[PDB]
Amino acid sequence: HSKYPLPPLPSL
Amino acid sequence: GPLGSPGPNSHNSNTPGIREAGSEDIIVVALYDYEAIHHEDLSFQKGDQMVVLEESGEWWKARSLATRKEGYIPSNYVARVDSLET
Numbered sequence: 001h002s003k004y005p006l007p008p009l010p011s012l
Numbered sequence: 013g014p015l016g017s018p019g020p021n022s023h024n025s026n027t028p029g030i031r032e033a034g035s036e037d038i039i040v041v042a043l044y045d046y047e048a049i050h051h052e053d054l055s056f057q058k059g060d061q062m063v064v065l066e067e068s069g070e071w072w073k074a075r076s077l078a079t080r081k082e083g084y085i086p087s088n089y090v091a092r093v094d095s096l097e098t
Binding site: 001002004006007 | 045049050052068069070071073084087089
């Protein structure tokens with residue numbers, strides 16, 4: 001399901 | 013007088029464990045720990061594998077291979093097992 005522009009990529 | 017004895021003949025139909033085929037299991041390893049940020053989403057850990065069932069766009073519906081759960085997961089947070097390099 002494409003609702004959000006993917007989550008915020010973390011650091012490691 | 014005449015006489016007659018009843019007694020039907022039950023029947024049924026069904027195939028056994030017929031050979032299988034047409035596989036499909038998109039395995040993707042979590043690139044980062046995820047604890048369901050938003051609703052309608054599965055929670056996993058960095059290194060966890062999931063069986064992607066549906067892949068609408070970005071988020072795919074895979075089942076955690078740890079709890080056999082089922083929920084949408086971010087693709088940007090996963091990487092196909094067959095998509096690994098060195």
